Amino acid sequence: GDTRPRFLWQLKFECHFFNGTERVRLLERCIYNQEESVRFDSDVGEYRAVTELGRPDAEYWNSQKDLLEQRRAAVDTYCRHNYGVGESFTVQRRVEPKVTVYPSKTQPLQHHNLLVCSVSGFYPGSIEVRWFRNGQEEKAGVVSTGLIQNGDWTFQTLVMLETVPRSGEVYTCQVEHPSVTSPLTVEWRA
Amino acid sequence: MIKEEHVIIQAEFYLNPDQSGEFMFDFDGDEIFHVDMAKKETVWRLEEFGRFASFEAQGALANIAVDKANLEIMTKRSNYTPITNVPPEVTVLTNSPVELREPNVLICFIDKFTPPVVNVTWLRNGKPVTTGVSETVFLPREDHLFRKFHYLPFLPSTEDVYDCRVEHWGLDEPLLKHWEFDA
Amino acid sequence: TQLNRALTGIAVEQD
């Protein structure tokens, strides 16, 4: 089929915010194929070449002082403006997770099993999940998948407990997320 | 990352010889919006975003023009050095815990690849399924590779198997990632 | 609704 060579140009404007908008750093980056050639760092104040491929540009652009002034002022005219425009639905987005507890595979008692706590559909990504056996925190057989980005502004996580269930035992998955005031608790009775 | 840090990225690319352009905004890894070069309209990733913010897509067109012109220059300046194909990693997950006969979504996550061209097919029981399917645009990564999400709404049953077929110039053969209900 | 701003790229040196 198609074997023709490919050539890729990427332009990235990164606005980094610290303590709300107390500190702002603008970073403009030009990437040829998979190599950054030239960048403007607001902490430097001028374009700098990363590779030889970018040296002429860094020179040429660094002679346009009107350009340099607009780029040094973009930390307010561009970054802070966009932060303010989107604060309501980005930095302040809170979606509550759904928590379910289920055995990974169906098997008899007194036999090793994997208890799954599914925490799904939450935003933002900072979360805390703990397992308890009859009220005591299990920190030994806990296997987590980590943060899974679904691509629709939601996260999910599977936190699993290695257990040898016995009749009467109660296992509990407790989750704390910035979207709920009180911990979410789901139980599974062996 | 740093709990007090937040990042907004404006990511553009132009790709030759495909003559493919892309203009999008990203917040902490999630797409806020992109400009569809066809229809010439701003597309917000979630609907609520469009109720507090707006963007005139025509201006983005201007940027893509500059990018095109710049690419054709840099290509010449590099003595026509082509891009190295980096094959993607493919994963298939579900949006939520699977409950038989209750609607759910299969997610095909394509990660760590370049150039940003990929052919994705959903297959139910070996046959291509195309109804209800969605996809994001190419999402930027800091190593300057790309991510992509493909979505297939489905009704979980014990009688259906699913596959995500991914084709990329860095793979020797098309890659099928398999999903089944296991119980 | 408020308007989201975008910077524009600069033309590269055609030396």
Residue numbers in the entry:
A (entry chain B): 1 to 190
B (entry chain A): 0 to 182
C (entry chain C): 1 to 15
Quoted from the paper:
Analyzing six epitopes, some with very low binding affinity, we solve X-ray crystallographic structures of each bound to HLA-DR1. In summary, each peptide bound HLA-DR1 canonically in the “forward” orientation that is described for HLA-DR,48 excluding CLIP. We observed little deviation in the overall structure of HLA-DR1 irrespective of bound peptide, particularly within the peptide binding groove, where the solved diversity of bound peptides had little impact on the position of the HLA-DR1 residues that lined each pocket.
More recently, S761–775 was identified as the most immunogenic peptide to induce CD4+ T cell reactivity ex vivo, including in subjects with no obvious history of virus exposure. S761–775 bound HLA-DR1 via the register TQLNRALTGIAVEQD, which placed an unfavorable Asn at P1 while placing favorable residues at all other anchor positions: P4-Leu, P6-Gly, and P9-Val. Thus, lower compatibility of P1-Asn for the P1 pocket, with preferences for larger bulky side chains, was the most likely contributor to the observed weak affinity of S761–775 for HLA-DR1 (weakest of all crystallized peptide-HLA-DR1 complexes) when considering binding motifs. Outward-facing residues across the core and PFRs were very diverse (polar, aliphatic, and charged). The weakest affinity, S761–775 (IC50 > 10,000 nM), was the only complex where the P1 position did not incorporate a favored aromatic side chain, which may point toward an increased importance of peptide-HLA-DR1 affinity compared with other pockets. S761–775 was more stable in comparison, but exhibited a single mutation, N764K, located at the P1 anchor residue position with HLA-DR1-S761–775.
